[PDB]
Design a protein around this ligand. Structure first.
Ligand SMILES: CC(C)=CCC/C(C)=C/CC/C(C)=C/COP(=O)(O)OP(=O)(O)O
Ligand SMILES: CC(C)=CCC/C(C)=C/CC/C(C)=C/COP(=O)(O)OP(=O)(O)O
Ligand SMILES: [Mg+2]
Ligand SMILES: [Mg+2]
Lengths: 235, 235
């Protein structure tokens, strides 16, 4: 890797958990258990190579359509993840954050995530950002409702609204846009993830199912990214 | 092709014109001339197989950064395209439309496009939609400014705003979202194209440079699309 060109913000769509379990004739939830564990692997390497922000698509606003047993299992898994891994996150200087409508989560999940946020609030290393009950269209709807009230309450007109003003009212207002979006499993689509923020991101569609995605694969994606030629509409 | 599953709306990022000319040691504008001609090829096949909407990314809000000679050439090419091809568009029942901030175009280009719009306004076949001076972030900024005024002038609160209401205030309010987004040249990014509307589109990153993209290649992309398994967040 060119150590002077580590991306600041990698976003990942963690797809293929279900297929990983079905290849092994196991229930879909087993694939989610293993995908939860794989988050720990990827968090370690991203932190050790100096990525600043890692956003993971854990549960979309459309995933409520799935069987309740699967929704409940995914929504409970942060409790298991933090019980075993929070001490290492604190020691590695990682700061835990979320984006999405996290008030809809089980109360025990809200409590475990709030505890992890408070215990890492002053950490200055990798920001590990879980997008949970998150979707780009609903993010924009919410941000638009807030900008409408804010401008009216500040006695302002919509002439102030520009692309920059929108950036600063999104759930991702404190993060740069990702340079790199990775999706595993070989699907080629963004599925409502960060749709405003990925306007000029490089995309990598990695063929491994998420539970098989490991440190070496992350490094291979970064090396591919370092070969891309970004132009932002110019020459 | 499965004739019962022709996508209704294909969106295409027409990339690689510059590289096509540079491979031949020709100026970049020559590649744009040839890309203009290739639009005619693709319009014919899309219309003959029964695609309903074809949106082409002709000039982005970021492409103003490019050399003025190149911007002027691209902005003038619709005049040449319509002079030679408008009669065939009228006979093929195609309806010409645009999205973007088309008031910024040369006056002779505005006149030629307005003439083509008027002469095809009642056509019921393929909608051939040029995205010219178009970008998804600026589209959203403009739509947001309009929704803020509309709600205030109708004595409404922002509680009405939902994903549907946004769809109905975009430049693409009269089009379904594309099932398929194709980008030529092997770049893997969306570059501000239709960023709200492609939330669940299938992506195909075709390796041909745009002037080499032909009917056979379009049909191959549709056959790939017909093999994709779309899930919209569910199982
Ligand atoms: C700390 C924390 C957030 C833990 C929870 C992590 C976790 C298990 C997120 C689920 C991610 C998800 C919906 C993957 C999609 O694979 P898929 O089900 O679509 O797989 P398929 O396409 O092969 O069926
Ligand atoms: C009717 C009508 C709208 C005519 C005009 C069509 C036309 C020539 C559009 C230009 C499309 C464009 C900016 C392609 C990008 O290739 P690129 O310049 O980025 O190629 P490169 O990446 O290989 O340099
Ligand atoms: Mg999936
Ligand atoms: Mg290009």
């Amino acid at each position: 890797l060119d150590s002077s060109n580590i991306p600041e913000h990698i976003a990942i769509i963690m797809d293929g958990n279900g297929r990983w379990a079905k290849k092994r004739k196991m229930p879909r939830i087993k694939g989610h258990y293993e995908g939860m564990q794989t988050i720990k692997k990827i968090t370690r390497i991203a932190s050790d190579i100096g990525v600043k922000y890692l956003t993971l698509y854990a549960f979309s606003t459309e995933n409520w359509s799935r069987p309740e047993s699967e929704v409940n299992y995914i929504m409970n898994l942060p409790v298991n993840f933090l019980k075993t891994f929070l001490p290492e996150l604190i020691e590695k200087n990682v700061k835990v954050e979320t984006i999405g409508f996290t008030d809809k989560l089980p109360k025990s999940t809200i409590e475990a995530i709030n505890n992890a946020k408070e215990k890492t609030a002053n950490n200055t290393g990798l920001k590990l950002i879980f997008a949970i009950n998150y979707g780009g269209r609903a993010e924009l709807v919410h941000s638009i409702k807030n900008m409408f009230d804010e401008l009216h309450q500040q006695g302002l007109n919509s002439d102030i609204i520009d692309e920059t003003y929108i950036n600063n009212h999104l759930m991702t207002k404190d993060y740069p846009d990702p340079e790199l979006l990775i999706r595993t499993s070989g699907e080629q689509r963004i599925s409502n993830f960060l749709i405003w923020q990925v306007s000029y991101s490089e995309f990598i569609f990695n063929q491994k199912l998420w539970p098989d995605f490991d440190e070496d694969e992350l490094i291979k994606c970064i090396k591919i990214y370092q070969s891309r030629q970004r132009r932002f509409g110019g020459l």
